[PDB]
Structures are given as structure tokens and as C-alpha cells.
């Protein structure tokens, strides 16, 4: 709690789509190395020996993403051999958790300058690839009432009474704001186009975006679940008072499966000044909380409350709320629980529009908020994501 932690740079790749995506040919390691070389380009005289760690979120750390991808990045980019490299996994929140841990390392006083972020090539390393201590184990899968997150999202919609039209209205709005953000030039500085070994362009934009989405188009889509297991029945065994789960989530109002990476430079004031870096925002506070593991995407609500309480702030004090758009209903429920003003929420669009590359999303939506605070000349953003098993992570940042 000694040293203040500052954000000096926050960049990301564009997000490539799952089917015939432009990034499918690109190794997740290359995605990270590309971002390192952009930071190198932006600050050619930074003494890299002063970077003590590289912390990356990765949800499926296997195959192309195995063997501590953070250390692979350090070595592959030719960073000093003393710069560390650790892979971490806290599911959907991994990206922000890496930033949070980086900031906490700086606060402890034992690290000075850290690279944090995450990477997920979902088209090359599909969700679930890593197996899972739970699923590989019927004895504990049975005891712990595992249901996939989509089922929880549908259940949230059922309980809170969000209709199919309600969730699709949120989806349409996400697409609209992503489009507006892109045309507005809001992302020109932070989305770093991906190039090959020869300098040729592979991708410069979030290709999952469907900017011409309509109410009518969204209404035509089929529900995702009704997985073909028995998860509805399992869900209703815990939630015995609910008769029937209303399945409202589709490929149009759920986050996209995409390829992407993000990097955030975090350091103390001294670290940054010494290397001639300009701070863009300060990490005010972080929190980890959670809620029920069957309605698993309801953990952002107590996590936000905990980070607000900890920074001595109230909902009114926050200018921008950024909550990952894993599922429309999760967002709507969060907005309802906390009375979040519509115009303060996911103002530049979210993962329904641009995709949710698991381990990287936390860092992407953090950087998105750093840029937006700067652009609006506003003061405070709160960034939050739900997690599998019923966890939540949340961070407050203040523009400096």
C-alpha cells in the first residue's frame, strides 16, 4: 500500500474472428511479440533491464499457449533475460487480474516496472482445450453443480425478467457504439495492426463487428442452448422455485469467440519518470469477490461494491462503467443492481460487437477505458468482469 501504481501504455491487437479469421494463421506468441515491439517503437530509449516482470492472462495455456507464454514472449522478443514472465489463469478475468497483480506488485514496493496483459487465440486453442480438473472428475463435477455460463445467463434473464427483445436491444446498442467508436477514430492509437514477418498487413480492425445489425436481424437468430446435456435440469435443482429457463441468448447477444492480445505497462512514479514515461492513469483500487456458482456470471456485482467501498467511492463518483459483455443479461442485471446510468456503460461498445478473447479481454477493456477517460477529459472508470465458478474482479482507475 506504499507505492502508487500508474498505467503508462495500454495497447491491443485488433480482434480476429473465429471462422475464416485473419488472425488464425498467427501464433498467439506472435500476437504478444507484436505488441512488445510497438512499445519498443513508442519508447525506443526505455532501459528494458528495469522491467522486472511480464504477467499474462491466458485461459487455455496449452499447445501454442503452453510452457509459460509470458516467458516465451520475453525470450522471443529479445527482452532482457531478467524480465521474468508468468502465465496466470482466473478465467474470463485473467487479463485484468494480470494488470491487478502487476499493480499490486508495484504497490508492495518489490517490483518497479511490469508488463501486464493477456493473450487468447481461440481459433487455434479453443476454450476447454486445457481439459479441466472439474470435468475430468465426475465425483466433484457431480457434487459442485456445474452448469456452463450460457445457462446461467439464460437463468439471469429468466429471474430478472429480461426478454429476448431486451437482450437483443442491448446487443444492437453494443454494435452501434463499437461502430461509432471506430468511425470516431477513438481506437486509432490503441489498436495496433497485426503484420507478418515481412511487414505486410494481416489485420487492422475488429472483424467480428457487424455494424449493420438490426432489431429484425437479431430476432431471426436461434438460441444457443435450446449444450445438449442435462444442465437446465441441474440449474433448476438448485433454483427450485424457478419453473422453466427462458433461453434468450444467441450468437448475436453473446460475446464473440475471437483471437487477440493486450499489453499494459505499469509502474511506480519513479520508475516512469526515470525512463521519461508519461503516466496516463492511476490504479485507485482493485477487488476480487464473487457469487453463486450455478448462476455463475453474477460475481461482478459484489466485486464492484467491494472496490467502490475500498476506494471510498460511490456509483455517482464513477464517470465510466466498463463491464465485459460476456452475455447481454449479465450486463443488464449489473446495470439494474447498481442503477448504472445507461450513458455511462460500455460507452465504446463491447464483446458482443468486438469479441471476447478470454485471457486478453480484461486488459483490452482496461485500455479502452484509459483512452476514453483521456478523450472525454473525465476522471474515473470502473472496469469489471464476471468469471467461471462465480468469481468477479474489479478495478478503479483515475486519469492523471
Amino acid at each position: 500500500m506504499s507505492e502508487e501504481a500508474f498505467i503508462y501504455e495500454a495497447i491491443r491487437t485488433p480482434r480476429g474472428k473465429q471462422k475464416n479469421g485473419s488472425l488464425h494463421e498467427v501464433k498467439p506468441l506472435s500476437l504478444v511479440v507484436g505488441l512488445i515491439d510497438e512499445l519498443r517503437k513508442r519508447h525506443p530509449d526505455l532501459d528494458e533491464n528495469l522491467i522486472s516482470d511480464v504477467i499474462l492472462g491466458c485461459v487455455s495455456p496449452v499447445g501454442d499457449q503452453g510452457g509459460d507464454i509470458a516467458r516465451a514472449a520475453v525470450l522471443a522478443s529479445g527482452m532482457p533475460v531478467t524480465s521474468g514472465g508468468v502465465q496466470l489463469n482466473r478465467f474470463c478475468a485473467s487479463g485484468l487480474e494480470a494488470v491487478n497483480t502487476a499493480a499490486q506488485k508495484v504497490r508492495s514496493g518489490w517490483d518497479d516496472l511490469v508488463l501486464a496483459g493477456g493473450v487468447e487465440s481461440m481459433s487455434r486453442v479453443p476454450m476447454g482445450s486445457d481439459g479441466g480438473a472439474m470435468g475430468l472428475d465426475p465425483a466433484t463435477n457431480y457434487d459442485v453443480m456445474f452448469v456452463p455460463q450460457s445457462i446461467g445467463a439464460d437463468l439471469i434473464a429468466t429471474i430478472e425478467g429480461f426478454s429476448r427483445e431486451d437482450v437483443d436491444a442491448y446487443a444492437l446498442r453494443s454494435q452501434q457504439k463499437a461502430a461509432e467508436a471506430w468511425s470516431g477514430g477513438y481506437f486509432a492509437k490503441s489498436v495496433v495492426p497485426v503484420r507478418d514477418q515481412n511487414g505486410l498487413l494481416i489485420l487492422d480492425h475488429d472483424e467480428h463487428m457487424r455494424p449493420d445489425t438490426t432489431k429484425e436481424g437479431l430476432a431471426k437468430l436461434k438460441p444457443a442452448f435450446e449444450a445438449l446435456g442435462g444442465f437446465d435440469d441441474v440449474a433448476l435443482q438448485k433454483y427450485h422455485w424457478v419453473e422453466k429457463i427462458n433461453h434468450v441468448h444467441t450468437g448475436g447477444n453473446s460475446s464473440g469467440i475471437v483471437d487477440g492480445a493486450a499489453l499494459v505497462m505499469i509502474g511506480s512514479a519513479a520508475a516512469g519518470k526515470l525512463q521519461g514515461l508519461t503516466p496516463r492513469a492511476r490504479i485507485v483500487a482493485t477487488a476480487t469477490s464473487g457469487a453463486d456458482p450455478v448462476i455463475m456470471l453474477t460475481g461482478p456485482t459484489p466485486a464492484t461494491r467491494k472496490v467502490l467501498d475500498r476506494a471510498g467511492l460511490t456509483v455517482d463518483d464513477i464517470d465510466l462503467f466498463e463491464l465485459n459483455e460476456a452475455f447481454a443479461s449479465v450486463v443488464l442485471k449489473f446495470q439494474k443492481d447498481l442503477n448504472i446510468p445507461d450513458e455511462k456503460l460500455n460507452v465504446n461498445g463491447g464483446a458482443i460487437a468486438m469479441g471476447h478473447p478470454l485471457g486478453a479481454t480484461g486488459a483490452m477493456i482496461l485500455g479502452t477505458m484509459v483512452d476514453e477517460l483521456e478523450r472525454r477529459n473525465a476522471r474515473r472508470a470502473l472496469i469489471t468482469l464476471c468469471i467461471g465458478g462465480g468469481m468477479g474482479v474489479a478495478t478503479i482507475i483515475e486519469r492523471v
Binding site: 479441466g132 475430468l136 465426475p138 453443480m145 446435456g229 442435462g230 435440469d233 441441474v234 435443482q237 419453473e243
Partner: protein
């Protein structure tokens, strides 16, 4: 490492050793202490000696045949021993089952072919001995069954059954086809699913066929003789191992699908089998085998296996051996059955009697009515032909055994009457009156009534000696209980005749003394009455239905309440109230009665009238009636789910003990099987009487724990939950 139960300083021998001139050893299992071979202490010591000897004389042995000298091959584990295992006996149970498997593992890795010669039933431990062989030949004889039914006793196949079938068929197939339900297969089915390799027509062919097979195998496949497929270098588990991408994709769904099937009921066995299956597939054979033992020991030393062994082994056995059948009485074969009434029950009763090979006259008030009653059997036969479970020739003969009629005179030559007309005493008097003089003088006069006392029905006939309650359950083609009710004047001979009829139709009997509501109706009454009371108290109907299903009932209580008519429930309550008010007493109505009356007043009295707790559209149950919530202020009472479960189970357990006290039931065996088969009391409890002695909750096990919980529920919900004196010190 030893093949024996002991290794420090006398049981009977059960294995006959014979070595051929060719070097083929025949092991003939023949326990001298019983009609069947069981996996007991004598078996274990016997096979240990034999297996030691196979090793010792290996230079002179070319092959092995495992055979039986009984009518059956081998009949499974020793239940009498297994039922007694306390938690502190986990180590011994684990050791026993590891020893059994060590012997079978040696048999299987001998370097020579071993063939099981399956003369008759090979069940549980029996089939496990066979699966440890390299080839299985089965005699295609009558009555012969093969399978691993230990899940039906709340156990698992702990002598290698899980490990081997998973190794043979992969996880999904072994679990779904063989393990999860423990189904018994005919030798022909056994061959089809791969549990058995070959069939011969007669028992005498087995040993020779086995020896011939060994001979050909040694000549044609010398390198792989006596090597199970999983013991080869290039082995590939069918369906893949858990780390293989195809299986990994569906695997997480397996426990959820199972929880769906079981509806959240607390039956540990299927879950343990699935964990054993999967965990075993992740590792080498021996490790897989040892995991299996741990899961086995876990079920055995638990309470549910105890409950289920008591009911589905001991209680069933006692019942099937004529425990409630009077002693002195001989047989009286049935020539012609007459059924009165062609509704669901009568039509159903006509089917099961016809399927059993009996000629049936099905009488209703019109030929049209009686015809549509026979149509019920035609429907069932149509399905049975489509599913391929019967031949056209066999089906046509079944249906031709049923003659529908409107004419009383057609009951000539009838020697067994089963009446299934409307629940009304004066009607039943009239209906029996129209028939008693037309039937054979020695005919049984049986009544399918759900509440009306038999003694009172009997007076409407001349020969009251032959009047009896023969109580079936809807749907008759599926429900396996017949509750036989002895009226005050019912003879012992009449009892036996109906007893024998029940067995003849493939059903299970209980013998009960005349009393209002008998056993089944009275007890099921308490169950649904608790549910309606919860609805009246303001509990979410959805929760009530969940509590019913998670308790282990085959149907949720409000749903069931619709099938039993609410007008029927009303006139039962009216009858009880009348008896008390006529005897100068004051009636204490069950809280449910007001809820029943409320629904009648609303014109929602059940499925038969198109509206109840559920909505019914075009012969189908749709969803719960959305108007229920406003009517009963649903949500205003939110008790723990376990309190709701317990209320239902406890109401029945308590009412069962009353029935036992009043002498309505005469054995706990009848109480248990009767509750399980008659009124769907959850299998995991072992029955409504076993539930008392075998209770397990947050605060202990046994009769004392049950009594404490019942007092707990009494304090919270009403005095009806206070235990009878018979349960207390």
C-alpha cells in the same frame, strides 16, 4: 500380493480341479453349502488355492476352463456379509475386494487362454469371474441371465466389473448399457452387446466347445493367446480415454445427465460407478482396479447400500418365498378370468392377465365400452411389435385371449373375478350381484378398490369366503405390486389363490388386513396431503415439485394429485370425518383438506376434468397453472428444501409405523416392498419402514436420529409429525 484372506496361523472347498491329458485345467465351481456359487469366504479361499496351483503347475498347463456344477453359473457377492460392514470395516472390505481381484488378475495374465463355460445365470460377482476370462461361451438355455446388477443393491461391480467393461466398451457404453442400471440380459442379448462371445444350444456342449476353442486359439494365435485386448501394446479404449478430444467434449455432460436422470435424488451408487469408470480410464489397469475397490468400500459401508440390500435382496426374497402366503394351502389353477370395468384399471388388468396366458372376459355396460378397453391392449401390442419385443403370432394370440362383452351371461365358466368399476359401495354390490350366480361356484370374487373396506363389500355377495381385495396400481401394465386385502370373512384359501395369481402374472404381492385406506392408499395420502399443505402455507409449487423429485419419488406430488382425483380425495376426507362425528368425536381436518376444497370450488379438480394444479391441453400436461401463485400467495413461505423433502418422506414413514402397530401390515418386508412398488417410495430408502431404522441426516443415523428429526419437524410444522409410542423408549 497374496491370493489369500489370511497370512498367519478352516473354510470349505468349492472348486473341483481336473487336468486333461492336453494340459487343460477345468475349474468347476461347486459350493457344497448351497444351491448357488457366491463370492463368499469359501469361494475366496478356494480360488486362491486354485490360482496358486495354476501358477505352480504352469509348465504343464496349456489352458483353463472355468465352469459350474450348479443350475446357475455364479450368483454374485455374499450379501449376508456385505450388509454388516460398518464404516470402521472399510479397510477389511477394501482388502477383501482387492484379494478377489488379485486372483482374477492372475487368471487373466497367466500367458494361456482361459474360457468361461457359462451354463446358467452369471450375475454380478459371477459375470466378473467370467470377464476375467479371455473368451466367454454361454449355454442358450431357459431362464439364463447375465449382467452386473450391483447398482440395484446400491453397490457397484467391485470385483473388476467396472474396470473390465470400461476397458471392453469404453466409458459411455459400459456405463449406459451395463453399469448404470445393472440390467440383466438373456444369453442372446449378452452376445449382441459383447458381454459374451459365443452361444451353444445345450449345457453339455460348453466344456467341449471351450476346450476346442483353447486348442484353435493356441494354434491360430500363439503370440496373443491369453492376452486381453487392454493388455496389448497398441490398445485403444473404444470412445477414447478422457484425455482424447472427442470424449473430452462430451464428458463434462455425463454427471449432469446422470443428475438429470436421478432428478437430484440421494442415490450414491450411480455417481460412484461413473467416477470409478472415468478415473479408472485415466490410468493403467491395476491402478484402475484399485480405485474401483475404494469406491466399492465407500458404498458398502454407507447407509443406502444397507437400505437397498435389505429391500431388494432380503425383503424381496422373503416375499417371493411366500412369507405372507398362508401355510397349509395347495394350488387351484385358473381357467377363466372375468374383469368388470373397461377403464384404465380394468383394461390394464385384462392385459396383464392375458399376457400371462389366461383367457379373459372383459365386461362393461356396453360393447362399445368393452371394445375400447381391449383397445388399450391393442395399443400396447402395437408398441411392442414396433419396438420388436414380440412376434405377430404371439401378439395375435394375446389379444385373442380377451373377449369384450356387454352381457353378464358371458361370465359363464369364469373362476376368477376381478372387479374394477367406480369407487362406490352400492354400485359394487349391484355389479357383483349381477354376476355371482353366473360364475363358477368356486370363483374368487376380487375387488380393485382403493379405499372402501372389503368386509363391507363382501356382504353384497352370498359366498363371502371367496370375497377379497385385489388392488392394482395405475398403469397396470407397468406397476409391479398387487396389494391383497383380507376382509373379515375372507378365507385363507382365497388368500393363497390370489397370491398365486399375482406371481403367475409376474407381479409382487403383499397381504394386508382390512382397514379403511388399507396400506397403499392411506400412506400415499399422507404424502400428497403434505404437498397440498405446503401449497396452502404459501410455498412455490415449483419448489414442491422439486422437493418431490429430489426426494426420489417417480412423480412430483401436485402432478400425482391430479391423477388421483381431487373429488376422490374429498370423499375420502368426508368419510373419515363422518366416522369420527358419528362416534361422538371431534374431527381434526388435515390442513390439505381446505386446499382440496379450494380447488374443487375453482373447478380445477384434476386431470380427469381437464384442470388441476397443472394445465392440460389435448391429452397432454402442459405447465403449472399460473393462477396458482395468486390463489395461495406462493413465495410468502420459503422453508428449506430439505424440510419439504423430509415432510413428505416422514409423513409416510410415520403412517407406515401406524399401519404396522394397528396390524394392517404383518411384516416390515411387506411395508417396504409395498411402499416401493405400490406407491413409489424412493428406492434409496429401502422402503417406508426401512426409512425409520436406516434414517441418516445432519444429526445422526438410525431410529434415534429419525425420532429427533420427527420432533424437529413436529415443532416447526405441527403435531402430526410426533412419532408413535412404538418408536420411543
Amino acid at each position: 500380493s497374496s491370493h489369500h484372506h489370511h497370512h498367519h496361523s478352516m473354510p470349505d472347498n468349492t472348486i473341483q480341479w481336473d487336468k486333461d491329458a492336453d494340459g487343460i485345467v477345468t475349474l468347476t465351481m461347486d459350493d457344497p453349502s448351497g444351491s448357488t456359487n457366491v463370492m463368499n469366504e469359501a469361494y475366496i479361499e478356494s480360488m486362491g488355492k486354485a490360482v496358486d496351483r495354476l501358477v505352480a503347475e504352469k509348465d504343464s498347463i496349456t489352458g483353463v476352463v472355468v465352469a459350474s456344477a450348479k443350475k446357475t453359473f455364479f450368483a454374485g457377492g455374499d450379501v449376508k456379509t456385505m450388509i454388516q460392514a460398518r464404516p470402521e470395516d472399510a479397510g477389511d472390505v477394501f482388502n477383501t475386494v482387492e484379494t478377489i481381484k488379485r486372483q482374477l488378475r492372475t487368471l487373466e495374465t497367466l500367458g494361456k487362454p482361459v474360457v468361461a463355460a457359462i451354463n446358467g445365470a452369471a450375475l454380478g460377482g459371477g459375470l466378473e469371474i467370467a470377464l476375467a476370462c479371455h473368451h466367454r461361451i454361454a449355454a442358450d438355455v431357459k431362464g439364463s441371465q447375465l449382467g452386473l446388477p450391483e447398482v440395484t443393491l446400491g453397490l457397484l461391480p467391485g470385483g473388476g466389473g467396472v474396470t473390465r467393461t470400461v476397458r471392453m466398451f469404453g466409458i459411455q457404453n459400459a456405463f449406459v448399457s451395463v453399469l448404470a442400471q445393472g440390467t440383466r440380459f438373456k444369453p442372446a442379448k449378452a452376445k449382441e452387446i459383447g458381454l459374451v462371445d459365443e452361444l451353444v444350444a445345450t449345457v453339455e456342449e460348453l466344456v467341449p466347445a471351450a476346450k476346442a476353442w483353447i486348442k484353435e486359439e493356441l494354434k491360430a494365435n500363439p503370440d496373443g493367446a491369453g492376452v486381453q485386448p487392454w493388455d496389448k501394446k497398441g490398445y485403444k479404449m473404444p470412445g477414447g480415454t478422457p484425455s482424447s478430444p472427442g470424449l473430452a467434449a462430451i464428458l463434462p455432460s455425463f454427471p449432469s445427465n446422470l443428475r438429470k436422470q436421478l432428478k437430484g435424488a440421494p442415490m450414491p451408487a450411480p455417481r460412484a460407478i461413473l467416477a470409478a469408470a472415468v478415473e479408472g480410464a485415466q490410468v493403467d489397469f491395476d491402478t484402475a482396479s484399485r480405485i474401483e475397490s475404494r469406491y466399492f468400500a465407500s458404498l458398502v459401508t454407507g447407509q443406502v447400500a444397507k437400505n437397498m440390500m435389505q429391500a431388494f435382496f432380503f425383503d424381496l426374497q422373503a416375499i417371493n418365498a411366500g412369507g405372507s402366503r398362508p401355510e397349509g394351502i395347495g394350488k387351484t389353477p385358473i381357467k377363466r378370468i372375468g374383469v368388470l370395468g373397461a377403464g384404465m384399471m380394468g383394461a390394464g388388468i385384462a392385459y396383464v392377465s392375458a399376457k400371462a396366458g389366461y383367457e379373459v372376459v372383459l365386461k362393461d355396460v356396453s360393447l362399445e365400452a368393452a371394445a375400447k378397453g381391449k383397445g388399450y391392449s391393442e395399443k400396447l401390442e402395437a408398441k411392442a411389435l414396433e419396438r420388436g419385443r414380440t412376434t405377430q403370432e404371439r401378439s395375435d394370440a394375446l389379444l385373442a385371449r380377451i373377449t369384450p362383452t356387454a352381457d353378464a351371461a358371458d361370465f359363464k365358466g369364469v373362476d376368477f373375478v376381478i372387479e374394477a368399476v367406480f369407487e362406490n359401495q352400492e354400485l359394487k354390490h349391484k355389479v357383483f350381484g349381477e354376476i355371482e350366480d353366473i360364475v363358477e361356484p368356486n370363483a374368487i370374487l376380487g375387488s380393485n378398490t382403493s379405499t372402501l373396506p372389503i368386509t363391507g363389500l363382501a356382504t353384497g355377495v352370498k359366498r363371502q369366503e371367496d370375497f377379497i381385495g385385489i388392488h392394482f396400481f395405475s398403469p397396470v401394465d407397468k406397476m409391479p405390486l398387487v396389494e391383497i386385502i383380507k376382509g373379515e370373512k375372507t378365507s385363507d384359501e382365497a388368500l393363497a389363490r390370489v397370491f398365486d395369481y399375482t406371481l403367475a402374472i409376474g407381479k409382487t404381492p403383499i397381504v394386508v388386513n382390512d382397514s379403511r385406506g388399507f396400506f397403499t392408499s392411506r400412506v400415499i395420502g399422507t404424502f400428497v396431503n403434505e404437498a397440498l399443505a405446503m401449497l396452502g402455507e404459501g410455498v412455490e409449487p415449483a419448489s414442491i415439485e422439486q422437493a418431490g423429485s429430489q426426494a426420489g419419488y417417480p412423480a412430483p406430488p401436485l402432478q400425482l394429485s391430479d391423477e388421483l382425483n381431487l373429488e376422490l380425495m374429498h370423499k375420502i376426507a368426508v368419510a373419515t370425518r363422518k366416522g369420527v362425528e358419528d362416534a361422538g368425536g371431534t374431527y381434526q381436518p388435515h390442513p390439505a383438506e381446505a386446499v382440496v376444497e379450494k380447488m374443487i370450488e375453482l373447478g380445477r379438480s384434476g386431470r380427469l376434468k381437464g384442470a388441476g394444479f397443472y394445465e392440460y391441453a389435448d391429452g397432454k400436461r402442459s405447465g403449472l397453472w399460473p393462477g396458482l401463485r395468486e390463489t395461495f400467495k406462493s413465495g410468502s413461505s420459503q422453508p428449506p428444501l430439505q424440510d419439504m423433502i423430509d415432510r413428505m418422506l416422514f409423513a409416510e414413514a410415520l403412517e407406515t409405523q401406524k399401519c404396522l402397530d394397528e396390524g394392517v401390515l404383518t411384516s416390515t418386508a411387506d411395508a417396504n416392498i409395498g411402499s416401493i412398488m405400490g406407491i413409489g417410495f424412493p428406492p434409496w430408502t429401502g422402503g417406508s419402514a426401512q426409512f425409520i431404522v436406516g434414517y441418516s441426516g445432519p444429526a445422526g443415523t438410525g431410529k434415534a436420529a429419525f425420532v429427533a428429526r420427527a420432533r424437529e419437524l413436529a415443532a416447526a410444522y405441527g403435531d402430526r409429525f410426533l412419532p408413535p409410542e412404538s418408536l420411543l423408549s
